[PDB]
Paper text:
Cargo enzymes are directed inside the encapsulin nanocompartment by a terminal localization sequence (LS) that binds to the interior face of the encapsulin. EncFtn oxidizes iron in a similar manner to other ferritins, but due to its open structure, it must be associated with an encapsulin nanocage to act as an iron store. Together, the encapsulin EncFtn (Enc:EncFtn) complex can perform both the oxidation and storage functions of classical ferritins. Here, we investigate the structure of the Enc:EncFtn nanocompartment from the halophilic bacterium Haliangium ochraceum to gain a better understanding of the arrangement and stoichiometry of the complex.
Motivated by the apparent interior density in the Loaded-Enc sample, we performed single-particle cryo-EM on the Loaded-Enc nanocompartment complex. The reconstruction displays a T = 1 icosahedral arrangement of 60 encapsulin monomers, with clearly resolved secondary structure elements. Small pores are visible in the shell at, or close to, the two-, three-, and fivefold symmetry axes, where protein monomers interact with each other. Regions of the reconstruction around the icosahedral fivefold axes displayed a lower resolution than the other regions of the structure in a local resolution map. With the imposition of I1 symmetry on the reconstruction, the EncFtn cargo is not visible within the lumen.
Author numbering:
A (entry chain A), B (entry chain A), C (entry chain A): 2 to 266
Write the structure that this text describes.
């Protein structure tokens, strides 16, 4: 009831239309949720992730030893958007293409925020992502044909760093497009690369600079979601209605050495 | 009974022969019906598609607000053709190849009309097609080998425009022939292109200029058919019998930004 | 749910009071709905009436014949009004005469709009009424005593025009008052007139200029109502609440020669 959706001047079918418009973008753009570990939605009142460490408190007496637990507080993010009440009424009159452009804009903005956090961190929320926290040095992939061998090198790094398990290749939009549009003497590079990596389709990540190789053994990267992506009502005028996309989440790099960055090719 | 078929001097087997000749062409040339949404045949008395919008009426008093509903009236199209009564009698005498050339000519003319409407519109009937109404700028495919990368670019456009879902590639006759006859260093381009798009066979569209990429998520383009393609009787002489192919249809572009044109390669 | 009534700061009993105030006026002033054919309320998404005709499209090729279906799009009309929240609260405190004057004003305004459309048309909505579309010439009724004979003449016209069936006499307010207040040598004219027409009570129409005679055989005039007369909520202040009366309707003159106008007496 924190979304206050029943207070909106919106017919149920328009609610379904907005939800479908957002959900299609979320399932078609959330690369992070498909490749890291995901701790299920815990609700609104889930506040922080228990990391398990302890911090030694200075200036304590000798007869007592005092330590402070360490936690990772979640970040709650809301992106507002606005819709026309007449457009939403249209769907009650049988219309099937109401103007839901701002719904898509806000949904992609939220996807951008969460994925940029997952990959390249978020200093304000105290989140370090996969790329900004790996200790290895990023491989250089001079050309698209360099992708197979470089990928193998990455895997070697992960085996020499102790990180076993099948390794997935994640591609930024430029990298994904160039790899899948490339042929080596007619033979497509993507076929060889897919032979060298996990059997699943290669993940295209919009918010990833260059490319990445990461272990999928599990337990390396954990995304905690308190309140999953939701659409809620804020206010409304005679003609304009204000909604928001809301999510409470945090991201933890359990094993920083479980992924290797690859500069763009 | 609007086709008045029982009034024709045609034996039932000749009716079946004409129907088969038309139906084979319809299933082998109707590309539009296989790639857009199709609202089922509603019958003869289905007049218009309810778009759901409202139009503000000018010059109205202050104490009243008046709006006019908006609809898309269907177009009813008949193409006549003529057959020899003796040729149609032949099939009652065991003949299996009666001269049904005009049946094929009329059937392909109707296919041409409907597909040209679907792709490039029809101003007289107030129909805008997929190509004439997309807002993006058509990609340039200089050569057949340019097809993969260009296709990827198209998909990128659709993802940046919010149009998710699997993307199908539709080919004009020239484009289809050149793509499927082409090899890059021996490797066929069509294999790579088919790897880059939906798993179904690529659709060849005779009435398409260049090529097209379009989302198949559904809800983007809607073809409404009131009366499906039918053969009806008009008049007959001592030797000549006049029939027609009849169809009542309209086509709506729900989301103009759901498809990208590609100039021919 | 297009009326959004559950969002209003109005107790259920005040809703019932407003509905009763409107419904009494609607049943006591809607003359059109009692004398024309009425196609039932089809809902909000019913857009247009299928007239059944076809229009020949110019500039079409010879091998194809193209015709456009003809429809009559409905008109959606909303008249706003405003009520005091304190007055509506009074009914929760046992009050039985809350100030619902604006409810009556809006209800009579809507009755005026619909009946004026039915009788004298509405150019903006593309509606022709009964009076403006009859082909005969309006009879002249010099005095109230002229009513019987003139009425008979009207019936004669309808029989000579082929329009059979019992004929009803509809009276404008001036005509109704003058006829029912008139006596010929003590004998009331209304008795003779009622003997000459259908057994039902003569209909008083507020929005009718002069009088009218019309066949009640059925199939002559058709009123289509998509959304029937309803009261809906628009907005509200701390003290003021805005509602509206809403209706989607259109009116069709199937047989223009089925009624005769009579100039006022």
């Amino acid at each position: 009831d924190l979304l206050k959706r029943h207070l909106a001047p919106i017919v149920p079918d328009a609610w379904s239309a907005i939800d479908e418009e957002a959900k299609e973008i979320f399932q078609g753009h959330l690369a992070g949720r498909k490749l890291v570990d995901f701790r299920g939605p815990f609700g609104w009142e889930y506040a922080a992730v228990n990391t398990g460490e302890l911090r030694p408190i200075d200036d304590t007496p000798e007869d007592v030893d005092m330590k402070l637990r360490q936690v990772q507080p979640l970040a709650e993010v809301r992106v507002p958007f606005t819709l026309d009440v007449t457009e939403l009424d249209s769907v009650a009159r049988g219309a099937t293409n109401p103007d839901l452009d701002d719904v898509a804009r806000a949904a992609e903005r939220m996807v951008e925020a969460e994925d940029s956090a997952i990959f390249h961190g978020w200093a304000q929320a105290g989140i370090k992502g996969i790329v900004d926290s790996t200790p290895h040095e990023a491989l250089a992939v001079a050309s698209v044909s360099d992708f197979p061998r470089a990928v193998l090198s990455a895997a070697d790094t992960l085996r020499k760093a102790g990180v076993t398990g099948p390794y997935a290749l994640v591609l930024g939009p430029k990298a994904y497009d160039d790899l899948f549009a490339a042929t080596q003497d007619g033979y497509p590079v993507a076929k060889q690369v897919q032979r060298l990596v996990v059997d699943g389709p290669l993940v295209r990540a919009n918010a990833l600079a260059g490319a990445l190789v990461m272990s999928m053994r599990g337990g390396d990267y954990e995304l905690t979601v308190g309140q999953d992506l939701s659409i809620g009502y804020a206010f409304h005028d005679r003609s304009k209605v204000e909604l928001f996309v809301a999510e409470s989440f945090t991201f933890r790099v359990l094993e920083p050495g479980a992924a290797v960055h690859l500069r763009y090719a």
